[PDB]
Amino acid sequence: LHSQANLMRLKSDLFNRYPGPTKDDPLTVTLGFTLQDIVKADSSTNEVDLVYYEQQRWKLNSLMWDPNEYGNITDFRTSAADIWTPDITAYSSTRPVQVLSPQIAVVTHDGSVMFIPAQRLSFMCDPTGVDSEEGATCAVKFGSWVYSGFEIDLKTDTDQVDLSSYYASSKYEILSATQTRQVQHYSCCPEPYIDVNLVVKFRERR
Amino acid sequence: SQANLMRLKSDLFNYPGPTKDDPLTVTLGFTLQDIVKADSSTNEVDLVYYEQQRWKLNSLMWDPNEYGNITDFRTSAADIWTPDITAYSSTRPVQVLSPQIAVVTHDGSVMFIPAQRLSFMCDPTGVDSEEGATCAVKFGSWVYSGFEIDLKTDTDQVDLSSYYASSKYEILSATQTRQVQHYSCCPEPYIDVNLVVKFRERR
Amino acid sequence: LHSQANLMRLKSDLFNYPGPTKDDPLTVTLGFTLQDIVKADSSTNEVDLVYYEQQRWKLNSLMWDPNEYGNITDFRTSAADIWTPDITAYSSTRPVQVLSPQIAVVTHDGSVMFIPAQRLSFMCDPTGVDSEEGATCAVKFGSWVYSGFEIDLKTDTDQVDLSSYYASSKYEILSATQTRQVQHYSCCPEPYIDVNLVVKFRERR
Amino acid sequence: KLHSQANLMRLKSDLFNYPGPTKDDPLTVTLGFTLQDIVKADSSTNEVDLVYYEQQRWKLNSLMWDPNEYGNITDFRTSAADIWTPDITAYSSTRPVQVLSPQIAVVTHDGSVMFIPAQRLSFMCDPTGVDSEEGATCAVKFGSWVYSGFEIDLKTDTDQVDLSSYYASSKYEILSATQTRQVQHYSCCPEPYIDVNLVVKFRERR
Amino acid sequence: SQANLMRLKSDLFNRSYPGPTKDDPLTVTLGFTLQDIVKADSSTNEVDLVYYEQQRWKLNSLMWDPNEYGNITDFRTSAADIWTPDITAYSSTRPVQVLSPQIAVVTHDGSVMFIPAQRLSFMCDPTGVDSEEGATCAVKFGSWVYSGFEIDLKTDTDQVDLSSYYASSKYEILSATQTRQVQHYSCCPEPYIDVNLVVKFRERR
């Protein structure tokens, strides 16, 4: 019972009292993808639909505390709406992302945050060769829409997409799936933007 | 009578979810109402069902004698904490087919029974045979591990007593089973109730 | 401004109810006007209807004396500004699509009327629709969370209003009835009330 | 510049900080349709989809002001949500209307308001004969859902639907399109309701 | 540095913009980046595009001195925190779908840049797409409610940016131009400004 009034004393003290990153306050977001399924490939429009979850990690000094003086709370679940989250976007989506999981994140006492939204995405992809041995290869990069490498940097823990939850009876078998940090330039802006590029080769099952 | 109830609600409302120190057990039961569609071009199947959810909070307890012998009441689910029970292998956002209103009883227990339509990952191969198709989908808290939310069932049988009698697909069997599993994000295990459905096309 | 200010003052007073109970129960009267059977899907056994649903109920908490409020006898209000019953179609397969403005009318005796137009997909096997005998389907409506002890349902007629049915629909209506029923549900000991809409239809000749 | 926006921000504050029409204080709404396109005709469901915009004009004494007491301001743009708007609805839609334009109205100093939303509407319509020289004919009426002829009256400026912006390469050519005020009874209510009936004759382009 | 920023945004927002007037007009620069022609429907004559709409404008009310806010020169903010122009496609057939965060960048001289990604269905007869010559379609963009006297438009170039066009699209772009036009509409005596996007395209191979 005391435990609950310690948490709401913490949540109140952190929240009731962060404008996003700046070049003076740069931030690094670690990204990693777990591909659950390739649902559909449309060769009349060259759209492919993926189901996956995107693990996101970042850290802020604004959210730090000392467990010692909050009944030894080390972390808490909270709405993603109640905290700053990064605007990590797919570059070649052809439809708005459909969110498949609760929008709840976990804040740890070192100020570190973790969010793992599950999503359905339609993206630009030519499935030619998916009915052949070689299969088809498509790619899609993910990055902050409005924050350049000076404000938001990206990182991965591995270049292999997690395939351990891939749906074993999908219409499409995964032949490879990698995730790789890149740096590119864009017409709007002198400054470079960071992406993590998701490349997947796939073909029709047996 | 009415004054008692509007006093009770304002008293009870004016809980930050479960913690390791204060865990919660949620009881789950499924009632399968219809297998609407089986798509063999994308391997997706669409179900209409209820998700019975039961849990209990000390913070929602009261003495009926102090509130005109009121023992329970209806409230919007938005007025109370509800569990983030999610299908692991959905391919589209869940569509809610019923009012989201729960019932709280004086012992702090809550019952909530939403109707939903879910598209999930399922290969219907064999649905046009005697032996039918078989698919599974597991349900659980997205963000709470077994240390914060535990699950249980009262029965391993999915309720088929209202299943639509003229559906395109007849149900051969449907079971609900609690499992424990690990996920890459986290060292703590997460609990699920796995729904396994066997079905085929109607005569 | 004098009748305008009398209405501001009235809506203030009334709006500034925890739903029905066993002690303070409620009767909702329902009627359906079927405008169209839009689509029958025999690959999924789903049929789509367009109709409007007249709802009536009465709260003592919405009563006022017109003499105290400039002889105002009734007013239009947003459905969100008042309590509305949770009348739900039992066998829907998609969320209900609202086709009309969500505005109710409250009268000085506390009665309320609300008449939402809706597109509904519900579970229906349309087999026989291409024969002289036609197809037959049913969908029942009722409170999701209130039993017969908290909400009762009534109809004025068992005939669905077909006077606005689309004359050039793909589907011709052989009959349409609306019938009050009392039934038990697994969740609960106490029976719930429904109004059962039974439509009989065939492909246009 | 600064001053004229000081006066505008004043006016809006003063006007915004009306319960709809009553029998004692009824309102006349003028309606006019501009048909942009017949997008689709579905003879499997007898539904037709139109894109059009709906000109709405009405006048309120509560929105009246003196231009001379507010820096010679004679009108302003405002969010359609910041004011009362009429609940004009199609009687035979088969799907919720989709709004294709910003929801912004213009209020003039005499209390008059104009609002011209673009919409896509599916409504009940048997396209039988769209592939003949005579074409198909369909009708849909528009009116206040909850206000009778005692509360809201409807009028048109012309019985001709504006076809000057009809899409020249539509799948369907317009033979005629008219808008006509009618009076009718409905089961719910002893009071008659007003509608403007839009009658369109069309055929396949060839 | 955090403090200065949260001091600025606070200063700019909770202490003042009512949109443009005839007395205080605004010029918006528009540029399009065509990403993909996704679909061409010859049964309904609709074509779906994915594109950016680069928008620039400038407000005196959004100006500040960097020396009074720790030499801050710009900042990111949600599109909802500020006024944005109501730039609309004239001939869309469905509501626009937003594909990117709605976040803008404000600079100390009061200038704003906003680059939303969108998918649009618009009116387009794709006859000829299966030929060497291809199909031609056009769609104009402008303020829905502001005339040339309130909002003017300009382009930075006649060339639609094709440098990110999807290389394996079903349709290859033959040309794409963006041209400012002036037009009168039935509602209003004043002329309304548009930027007209004209795209020539054909099936790939």
Ligand SMILES: CN1[C@@H](C[C@@H](O)c2ccccc2)CCC[C@H]1CC(=O)c1ccccc1
């Ligand atoms: C750079 N950005 C790209 C998208 C890009 O962020 C991206 C890169 C990789 C993966 C996803 C998105 C497309 C056009 C929009 C711009 C960012 C942008 O919107 C902006 C706005 C105002 C000032 C400065 C920048």
Ligand SMILES: CN1[C@@H](C[C@@H](O)c2ccccc2)CCC[C@H]1CC(=O)c1ccccc1
């Ligand atoms: C564990 N979880 C699974 C979903 C899982 O909760 C589940 C299990 C069974 C049935 C449905 C969902 C997918 C990936 C996301 C993680 C949980 C998760 O989102 C999280 C976020 C921050 C900190 C700790 C955990």
Ligand SMILES: CN1[C@@H](C[C@@H](O)c2ccccc2)CCC[C@H]1CC(=O)c1ccccc1
């Ligand atoms: C009884 N009810 C039916 C729906 C039922 O209300 C109904 C009846 C006729 C027509 C439509 C709906 C489906 C399963 C859910 C339950 C109501 C229900 O959700 C509930 C929740 C907590 C305590 C007691 C009851």
Ligand SMILES: CN1[C@@H](C[C@@H](O)c2ccccc2)CCC[C@H]1CC(=O)c1ccccc1
């Ligand atoms: C009159 N109305 C018609 C629609 C009608 O307004 C209409 C007429 C022409 C074109 C469109 C709609 C359908 C059924 C609903 C009723 C009005 C209505 O909703 C109501 C509600 C409470 C009290 C009194 C009236």
Ligand SMILES: CN1[C@@H](C[C@@H](O)c2ccccc2)CCC[C@H]1CC(=O)c1ccccc1
């Ligand atoms: C002029 N306008 C056009 C749209 C037009 O702004 C446009 C032009 C080019 C490209 C897109 C939109 C269609 C009909 C609506 C009117 C503007 C309009 O809605 C209005 C409303 C009240 C008072 C004055 C004007």
